[PDB]
Each structure stands twice: as structure tokens, then as C-alpha cells.
Amino acid sequence: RMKXIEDKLXEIXSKXYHXENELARIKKLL
Amino acid sequence: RMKXIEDKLXEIXSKXYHXENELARIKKLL
Amino acid sequence: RMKXIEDKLXEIXSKXYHXENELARIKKLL
Amino acid sequence: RMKXIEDKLXEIXSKXYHXENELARIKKLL
Amino acid sequence: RMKXIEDKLXEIXSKXYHXENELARIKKLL
Amino acid sequence: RMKXIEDKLXEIXSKXYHXENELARIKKLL
Amino acid sequence: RMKXIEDKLXEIXSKXYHXENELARIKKLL
Amino acid sequence: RMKXIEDKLXEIXSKXYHXENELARIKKLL
């Protein structure tokens, strides 16, 4: 319950890595 | 409570799909 | 506790609106 | 448990700052 | 950025008028 | 944006034909 | 990217001076 | 996108050589 939430919020804090690095793909095209 | 949180964190893990695919719209313009 | 989490996950599901509309700012420059 | 979730949802509401300001990097290149 | 590029490409499409008319100067010396 | 830039760069690569052929006007007056 | 494009569009707006002055070469041979 | 724009701006900076040398054709007819 709480732990398998905290280990989703694991996944989001990966998505907010791939936000950053796949923005930084775009910024470094521009 | 916990379940209807986990099935929001469903929605975010959709938003972090549409992050990716609607970045990949931009990258593939550039 | 749970409710004042669910009404943050309110805020994120606003941030994932302003993700979309402030991407769609960029796409519609390009 | 709940508090150390709420202080992750701290981190996301930082990532959704750096979403905004590192989009606004791109928009202000364009 | 993009708008103040496309409005240089304004200036070039003036240079490619003044190309033309200041050749049409020479052609009408000849 | 990008497409309606690249399709100006269409127009310039016409101006750089009409550069050429309306010089080849002068060269064949001479 | 965009800056090192706009500073090519620098070079072209030099070529469209040296267009002009090296025509004004010919016009003043004629 | 950006790369296949900058490598048109390649082609124009060839047209602005062949501007030059095929004027330097005329100047050396005169």
C-alpha cells in the first residue's frame, strides 16, 4: 500500500531524469 | 483512500506517456 | 494526511495542464 | 510513511519549478 | 529566435528585389 | 515555423536559378 | 543551433554588401 | 529540421562562390 506508493513516487522521481535529459536532447538541437 | 491515490499515480504514470510522446512531436519538428 | 496527499496529487494533475499547454507555446513557435 | 510521501510530493512540486524554468530556457532560445 | 530568423529571410527576399533590379541597371547600360 | 523557414530557404534556392540565368542574360549581351 | 543559423543569415546579409559593391565594379566598367 | 536548415544555409554560402566567380566571368568579358 504505502511502500508499493513510495516505490511509484521511485518511478516518477525516473520520469522527472528522463523530463530533464530527454529537455537537455532539445536544448542542446537548439 | 490508498487505492483511489494509486489509481492518481495510473494518471501520472499516462501524463509522464503524453511528457514523452508529445517531447518526441517537438524533437522529431527539430 | 491522505486527503491533504490527494488534494497534492490536485496540484500535480494542474502541473501536468501547464506541461501540456506551456509544450503546445513551444510546438505552436515551431 | 505518510510524511516522508508528502515531503516526495516536496520533490515533485521542485521538479514541476525546474519543468517550468528549464521550458521557459527553451521558449526564451526560440 | 524563430520570428526575428524568418523576418532575416524578409531582408534576403529585399536583397534578392535590389539582385534583380540593380542586374536589370546593368542589362539596360548594355 | 521551421517548415514554412525551410520552404523561404525554396524561395532563395529560385532566386539563386533566376542570379544564375538572368547573369547568363548579361554574359550572352557581352 | 538557432544562434550559430542567425549569425549564417550575418554571413549572407556580408554577401548581399559584396552582391552590391562588386555590381557597383561592373556598373562603374560600363 | 535545424541541421538539414543549416546545411540549406551550405548551399547558399555555394551560391554566394558561384555570385562571386561567375561576376568575376563578367568583369574579366569587360
Side-chain angles (χ1 to χ4, degrees), chain A residues 2 4-6 8-21 23-24 26-27 29-30, chain B residues 2 4-6 8-21 23-24 26-27 29-30, chain C residues 2 4-6 8-21 23-24 26-27 29-30, chain D residues 2 4-6 8-21 23-24 26-27 29-30, chain E residues 2 4-6 8-21 23-26 29-30, chain F residues 2 4-6 8-21 23-26 29-30, chain G residues 2 4-6 8-21 23-26 29-30, chain H residues 2 4-6 8-21 23-26 29-30:
Chain A
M2 296 297 83
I5 298 172
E6 201 163 4
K8 294 206 201 286
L9 295 174
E11 295 187 72
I12 290 164
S14 177
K15 298 298 193 178
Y17 190 88
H18 290 287
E20 300 156 16
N21 288 281
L23 296 188
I26 293 145
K27 198 206 192 285
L29 284 157
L30 299 179
Chain B
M2 296 297 83
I5 298 172
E6 201 163 4
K8 294 206 201 286
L9 295 174
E11 295 187 72
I12 290 164
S14 177
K15 298 298 193 178
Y17 190 88
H18 290 287
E20 300 156 16
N21 288 281
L23 296 188
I26 293 145
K27 198 206 192 285
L29 284 157
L30 299 179
Chain C
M2 296 297 83
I5 298 172
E6 201 163 4
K8 294 206 201 286
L9 295 174
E11 295 187 72
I12 290 164
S14 177
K15 298 298 193 178
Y17 190 88
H18 290 287
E20 300 156 16
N21 288 281
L23 296 188
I26 293 145
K27 198 206 192 285
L29 284 157
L30 299 179
Chain D
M2 296 297 83
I5 298 172
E6 201 163 4
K8 294 206 201 286
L9 295 174
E11 295 187 72
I12 290 164
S14 177
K15 298 298 193 178
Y17 190 88
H18 290 287
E20 300 156 16
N21 288 281
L23 296 188
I26 293 145
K27 198 206 192 285
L29 284 157
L30 299 179
Chain E
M2 294 275 87
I5 291 172
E6 199 275 340
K8 299 273 159 208
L9 288 174
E11 293 182 63
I12 296 169
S14 196
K15 297 292 190 199
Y17 195 88
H18 296 283
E20 296 155 20
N21 286 285
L23 297 186
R25 117 95 142 161
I26 298 158
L29 300 162
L30 293 174
Chain F
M2 294 275 87
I5 291 172
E6 199 275 340
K8 299 273 159 208
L9 288 174
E11 293 182 63
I12 296 169
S14 196
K15 297 292 190 199
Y17 195 88
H18 296 283
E20 296 155 20
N21 286 285
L23 297 186
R25 117 95 142 161
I26 298 158
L29 300 162
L30 293 174
Chain G
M2 294 275 87
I5 291 172
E6 199 275 340
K8 299 273 159 208
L9 288 174
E11 293 182 63
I12 296 169
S14 196
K15 297 292 190 199
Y17 195 88
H18 296 283
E20 296 155 20
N21 286 285
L23 297 186
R25 117 95 142 161
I26 298 158
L29 300 162
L30 293 174
Chain H
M2 294 275 87
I5 291 172
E6 199 275 340
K8 299 273 159 208
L9 288 174
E11 293 182 63
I12 296 169
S14 196
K15 297 292 190 199
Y17 195 88
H18 296 283
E20 296 155 20
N21 286 285
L23 297 186
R25 117 95 142 161
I26 298 158
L29 300 162
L30 293 174

